[PDB]
Design a protein around this motif. Structure first.
Motif, PDB file in Angstrom:
ATOM      1  N   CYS A   1     -45.475 -54.210  79.737  1.00  0.00           N
ATOM      2  CA  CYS A   1     -44.062 -54.511  79.899  1.00  0.00           C
ATOM      3  C   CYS A   1     -43.231 -53.285  79.542  1.00  0.00           C
ATOM      4  O   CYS A   1     -43.464 -52.651  78.509  1.00  0.00           O
ATOM      5  CB  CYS A   1     -43.676 -55.695  79.018  1.00  0.00           C
ATOM      6  SG  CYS A   1     -44.379 -57.260  79.568  1.00  0.00           S
ATOM      7  N   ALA A   2     -42.289 -52.927  80.420  1.00  0.00           N
ATOM      8  CA  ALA A   2     -41.253 -51.931  80.140  1.00  0.00           C
ATOM      9  C   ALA A   2     -39.932 -52.654  79.936  1.00  0.00           C
ATOM     10  O   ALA A   2     -39.414 -53.273  80.875  1.00  0.00           O
ATOM     11  CB  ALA A   2     -41.114 -50.910  81.271  1.00  0.00           C
ATOM     12  N   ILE A   3     -39.399 -52.586  78.720  1.00  0.00           N
ATOM     13  CA  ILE A   3     -38.081 -53.129  78.405  1.00  0.00           C
ATOM     14  C   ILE A   3     -37.134 -51.930  78.347  1.00  0.00           C
ATOM     15  O   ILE A   3     -37.127 -51.177  77.371  1.00  0.00           O
ATOM     16  CB  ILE A   3     -38.118 -53.953  77.112  1.00  0.00           C
ATOM     17  CG1 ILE A   3     -38.747 -55.325  77.404  1.00  0.00           C
ATOM     18  CG2 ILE A   3     -36.743 -54.146  76.538  1.00  0.00           C
ATOM     19  CD1 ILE A   3     -39.807 -55.756  76.396  1.00  0.00           C
ATOM     20  N   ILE A   4     -36.370 -51.721  79.425  1.00  0.00           N
ATOM     21  CA  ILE A   4     -35.518 -50.537  79.592  1.00  0.00           C
ATOM     22  C   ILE A   4     -34.133 -50.887  79.056  1.00  0.00           C
ATOM     23  O   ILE A   4     -33.516 -51.856  79.513  1.00  0.00           O
ATOM     24  CB  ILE A   4     -35.436 -50.111  81.069  1.00  0.00           C
ATOM     25  CG1 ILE A   4     -36.831 -50.160  81.704  1.00  0.00           C
ATOM     26  CG2 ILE A   4     -34.859 -48.693  81.184  1.00  0.00           C
ATOM     27  CD1 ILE A   4     -36.983 -49.468  83.043  1.00  0.00           C
ATOM     28  N   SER A   5     -33.650 -50.115  78.080  1.00  0.00           N
ATOM     29  CA  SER A   5     -32.334 -50.315  77.488  1.00  0.00           C
ATOM     30  C   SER A   5     -31.587 -48.991  77.456  1.00  0.00           C
ATOM     31  O   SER A   5     -32.191 -47.915  77.417  1.00  0.00           O
ATOM     32  CB  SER A   5     -32.422 -50.883  76.062  1.00  0.00           C
ATOM     33  OG  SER A   5     -32.758 -49.881  75.109  1.00  0.00           O
ATOM     34  N   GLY A   6     -30.255 -49.076  77.447  1.00  0.00           N
ATOM     35  CA  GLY A   6     -29.456 -47.856  77.415  1.00  0.00           C
ATOM     36  C   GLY A   6     -29.517 -47.128  76.083  1.00  0.00           C
ATOM     37  O   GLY A   6     -29.589 -45.895  76.041  1.00  0.00           O
ATOM     38  N   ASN A   7     -29.512 -47.878  74.974  1.00  0.00           N
ATOM     39  CA  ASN A   7     -29.419 -47.274  73.647  1.00  0.00           C
ATOM     40  C   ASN A   7     -30.771 -46.801  73.103  1.00  0.00           C
ATOM     41  O   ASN A   7     -30.807 -45.805  72.370  1.00  0.00           O
ATOM     42  CB  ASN A   7     -28.742 -48.259  72.684  1.00  0.00           C
ATOM     43  CG  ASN A   7     -29.588 -49.499  72.390  1.00  0.00           C
ATOM     44  OD1 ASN A   7     -29.828 -50.339  73.271  1.00  0.00           O
ATOM     45  ND2 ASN A   7     -29.959 -49.663  71.125  1.00  0.00           N
ATOM     46  N   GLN A   8     -31.892 -47.461  73.463  1.00  0.00           N
ATOM     47  CA  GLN A   8     -33.220 -47.050  72.996  1.00  0.00           C
ATOM     48  C   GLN A   8     -34.142 -46.507  74.082  1.00  0.00           C
ATOM     49  O   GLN A   8     -35.273 -46.125  73.763  1.00  0.00           O
ATOM     50  CB  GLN A   8     -33.943 -48.198  72.275  1.00  0.00           C
ATOM     51  CG  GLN A   8     -33.557 -48.341  70.796  1.00  0.00           C
ATOM     52  CD  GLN A   8     -33.842 -47.082  69.939  1.00  0.00           C
ATOM     53  OE1 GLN A   8     -34.376 -46.067  70.423  1.00  0.00           O
ATOM     54  NE2 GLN A   8     -33.432 -47.137  68.669  1.00  0.00           N
TER      55      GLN A   8
END
Lengths: 277, 277
Positions: free
Chosen positions: A205-212
């Motif tokens: 799983c890739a959980i793509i977030s702006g801050n991390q």
């Protein structure tokens, strides 16, 4: 310098689709249809305002490609799942949340100082659109600090539900990743089901977030007996999240690199202060 | 690499101020003040979220300048003309509106694809801030398709009313250009009065626009006769305007070039679809 035209002609594809939806929406729904739902004038006012803002956003993009001596992109053929007025807002909300990742990705290849600032200026105008519909559909207008980029093919995955056919070689969408649920606080186990029987050897799983950036993790199993993999929203993420299946440990920042991506992404609406409860 | 560290530091100043406001603002106001003022609990929620993003936006900046071998700038001495809840939202709007020109000015000088994408992502979250307060103060959250830059100095010109003293040598402001009225549609005549008795010989209005850029006009005379020079908003400008005084006519894009500025800019709230009537 063809890098820049590719990015711009890409964004024109984003804008064709964006503006085509707002023209048809303002042309088929009225102001009182908004008031019929518990919306005010300023909302339809803004909605019209979003329409014009797209036409300029499409317009500026065509006229730039021309002024560098390129070929502007013909539009594609679109379909919009619009029933009542409430659906119009979700189409807009997901449309508008998709420009921040599209633009931020596209800005990495635009080389000129001046060319960047006209584009970063449109990025801003869409951030308001995103927060406008977001607030207007119960979500937090500003769910977090920093917004992350994605790639062309990732934007194409997110749009693919709307594009019926493209009269030219578009960016290729990965198969759709279906999230269950598609929103909620940190820790939500979410039932990810791909729309193609792809290789599960090595998918993380890739959980793509702006801050991390992209947080990496290995999937689990739904007790349901359905047998769909589950990711769990990791700690320390903020704002808007893009969840995707990737294959490989050598590819890290998925927001700037689609080489390892197998399924999705699709958006996930992390809880945030501003959420209507 | 110099250019980048001064620009990140310039932005640190802006978030030092920005962070400072919102920590004290949530420290001296609760939900019930917003609930009394005709607002819903969720708006307080997003407000504390605005503080959290600002803190995130300052630290992120701090965390980066230290990383390239640089000295983060300390915060400055701050003044906040805040009384009721109605006053907090107004000032809120003033600083989030300042960010968009402030960030686009910065981004002209950060020389790296990666540093830029994380700062554009920050700028992006700031429009979400601005659209929220624009919406809450009866204004159009997305007033226009594109936002313009300002220089570091022009940002000090808009910031000077909240900055008492700076332990470091900051960007030197320009004389305040009080504007009257400060909101209206195309056609409005604005009553520009500087704060220093500057030489009228040579001055020009510079209506700074996002879509058209910067348009000069010959200062009017005060229809009353007050000597108070007047500008008039030209047509086909959308969004947010900045009205400064400029000596001469050599500088045509004063949004990226302040070498001919003598007073202002101050903000102008152009009437747009989304305003509350």
């Amino acid at each position: 310098m063809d890098m820049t035209l590719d990015a711009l002609n890409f964004l024109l594809g984003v804008e064709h689709l964006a503006s085509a939806f707002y023209v048809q929406a303002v042309n088929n729904f009225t102001a009182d249809d908004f008031k019929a739902a518990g919306l005010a004038q300023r909302d339809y006012d803004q909605f019209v305002g979003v329409r014009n803002n797209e036409v300029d956003h499409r317009d500026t993009l065509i006229s730039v490609i021309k002024s560098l001596g390129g070929k502007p992109n013909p539009p594609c053929k679109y379909t919009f799942p619009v029933t009542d007025v409430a659906s119009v807002l979700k189409v807009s909300r997901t449309l508008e949340n998709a420009d921040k990742p599209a633009y931020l990705g596209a800005l990495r290849d635009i080389k000129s100082v001046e060319l960047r600032t006209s584009v970063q200026g449109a990025l801003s105008g869409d951030s308001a659109h995103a927060a406008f519909f977001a607030y207007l559909t119960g979500k937090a207008p500003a769910p977090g600090p920093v917004d992350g980029p994605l790639t062309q093919r990732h934007i194409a995955t997110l749009a693919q539900d709307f594009i019926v056919s493209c009269p030219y070689p578009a960016p290729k969408p990965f198969p759709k990743l279906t999230l269950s649920p598609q929103s909620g606080p940190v820790g939500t186990v979410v039932a990810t089901t791909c729309a193609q029987d792809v290789d599960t050897n090595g998918v993380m799983c890739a959980i793509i977030s702006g801050n991390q950036g992209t947080l990496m993790q290995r999937p689990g199993q739904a007790k349901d007996g359905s047998g769909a993999a589950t990711c769990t929203i990791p700690p320390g993420v903020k704002g808007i999240l893009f969840i995707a299946w990737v294959r490989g440990r050598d590819v890290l920042n998925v927001g700037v690199d689609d080489s390892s991506t197998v399924c999705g992404p699709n958006y996930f609406l992390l809880s945030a202060l501003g959420d209507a409860v």
